[PDB]
Structures are given as C-alpha cells and as structure tokens.
Amino acid sequence: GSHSMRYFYTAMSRPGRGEPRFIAVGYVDDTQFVRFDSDAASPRMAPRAPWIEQEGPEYWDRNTQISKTNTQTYRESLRNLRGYYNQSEAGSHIIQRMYGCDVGPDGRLLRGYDQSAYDGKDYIALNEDLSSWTAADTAAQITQRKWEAAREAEQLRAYLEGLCVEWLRRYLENGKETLQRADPPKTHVTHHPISDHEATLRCWALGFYPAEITLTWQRDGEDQTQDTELVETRPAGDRTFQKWAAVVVPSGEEQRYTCHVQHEGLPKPLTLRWEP
C-alpha cells in the first residue's frame, strides 16, 4: 500500500587509522538498492538491486559526486562536533543520519524525515513541518544556526516534496515485480517439551516480505502479550524475513492456545494451532 524511501549515512572517525569513513545506503521499504563506501578502491554510488541498474550515467555520476562531497563535509562535521563537546582527538565518534519520505498508495507525500545522531544520541532533527529544527543540546544549536543561515530546511523540504517522491514513484514502478509483491509467510507450529508438566509452543513465519508482520499467541481468545517470547524479525538473505513467537503452556492445555498471523501477502489473516 504505502511506501518509503530512506537514505542512511554513517560517518565514523578512526584517529590514527586514516580519515573518517563515510558510508551511504539507500532503501525502498525493506529493500536496499544503492550503496557508497569511501574506503572502496574506486568510491562511487553502486547498485544493490536489479531494478536500479538501468539508471543512466548522469544518475550514477550525480549520486557519486554528491556522495564524494559528503565524504569531505562529514569529515569537517566530525571535527566541528568534537569541538562543540570539548572532546579529544584520541576517541572515535560517529555521525549518523537518516532522511527520506513516506508516500501513501496514491504516491502523495505523507511526511518527510531528516535526523541526525552523534555517538548514538539524538542530535538534531528536522521537524515534521519541514521548516524548523529541534536541537538536542547547546552543541546542536550551533549546527541549527549554521543550517538556518544555509537554508538547509528549505533545500530538504524541496527535496522531500520533489525528487524524493518522484524517484520513489519511479523506483516503485521499475521494481514493481518485487517492491510491490507481498510474499506471504510460510507458517507452522512446533512443540518442545520442557518438563513433565509444561512445553513450549513456537509459531513460525518464514519467507515473507515486507518485514512488517503481526505474530501473537492467544489463550482462550485472550492475548498472551506478557508471556510471549518474540524474536526480532531477521533477514533470510534472499530479500525475505523470518520471525517466531513462543509461549510456554501447561502440558495438556495446548488447544486453548492459538497463533495469529497478519501479513500483507496473506489473503486472510491466519489462525494456527499445534497439530500433533
């Protein structure tokens, strides 16, 4: 239905081990499609999905040029931030940035994002109005004043409402056979005895895309939220994802427990029981 494009920038200093490394990756929803790595032998924006390969030389040149410039600016910014916090030259530090757009099923912009973190902590974020900034501390206020004078917010707003949405529309059309194909999970329930009186029921979902899914156990129609172990959704390596939910039941009470599965690729939501 709805979709998103996000770019993720990480800039990492490594004192005594060369200049800071700059890595950029681009995603459409849960699919990576480009990457740039400043340590590469020949640094350039490079394809990571088939449907982006068809883009012309001016595309890869623009994306590589912007990324090369970013490599130097982020090196400047790490030096600046180290100063804002009176930090020494010995430690390694990390700027992270995420930005992009969400579009609804009509392809209209739902909202844009731009936000930054320093060493894992929120630093500065563009507000939802795409016009003002939230600075996290007095260091970030300096960055905010720099960006107001540079009209950063106006450039990002123009990008987020223009190129971001347009190219996302174009990416969704060119990769429609994968990006707009929802693969349903393969499901089943397993039974692992723990003792004479209890056993583990585990509800499995495999091979689904996109990663968004709902896996829940019920006891007598009642949700077992507190008592369900949920593993983090993990990638299979072939674009699809996996997940499981597990609950420990009194032996002999198994059939009071149901696993419920909602996913966009499912015709109908699923209800599964342990089948001995």
Partner: peptide, 9 residues
Amino acid sequence: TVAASGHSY
C-alpha cells in the same frame, strides 16, 4: 536518488 549535499554540522 540522494539529496543534494547539505551544509556541514
């Protein structure tokens, strides 16, 4: 496609 290079922090 990437946004244009932004200003330094």
